Amino acid sequence: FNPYGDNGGTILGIAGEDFAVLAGDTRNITDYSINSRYEPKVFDCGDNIVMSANGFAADGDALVKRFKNSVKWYHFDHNDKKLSINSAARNIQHLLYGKRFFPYYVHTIIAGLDEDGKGAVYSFDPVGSYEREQCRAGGAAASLIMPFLDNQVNFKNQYEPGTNKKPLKYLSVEEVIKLVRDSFTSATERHIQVGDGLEILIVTKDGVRKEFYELKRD
């Protein structure tokens, strides 16, 4: 008996200035069979936190349910105090490492705003190393997703034409959304697991917004 499986699909966190984007495909996979075309892979956890435990679907659901319950207890104990994104990250770290010898077979990403209101993204090893990050792809096509975005939000290995580096730019939230759109379109074009649809959660100082975009059904 093997207690793990691979359910495919992919997730992508992008940190803005005053926003963070968490995108994931909605297709659920087993072997070469499509299990469903719309599972919501990314979740609003409240406190302006969005989360996705990519990887084995069941362990992801377990981890996100344990996290949401821990948030409930955090509110009960601290009189509805907004859980800070760093405190959320530390919670999820302790939830993960509590499995150290039977780990949740998932890579998980949370996106939010810090106490400055600056865009925040954190990503965690299945055994709970974590880093503050400006962007992070995850899942099977992460190697397809990330280098394009590292070439379009960053300008790495680009130079000013003939002046043998071009400076990086701040991007509006809709412009990064459009870059996520195009990136996932390219990945569904070239990677068979990248789902039939793209669902995007936008975290802002006004709250969280959900956006959904269709992708190719094959």
Partner: peptide, 10 residues
């Protein structure tokens, strides 16, 4: 096949 199998497509 295209719709139901991942290996098939296009």
């Amino acid at each position: 096949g295209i719709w139901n199998d991942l290996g098939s497509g296009s």
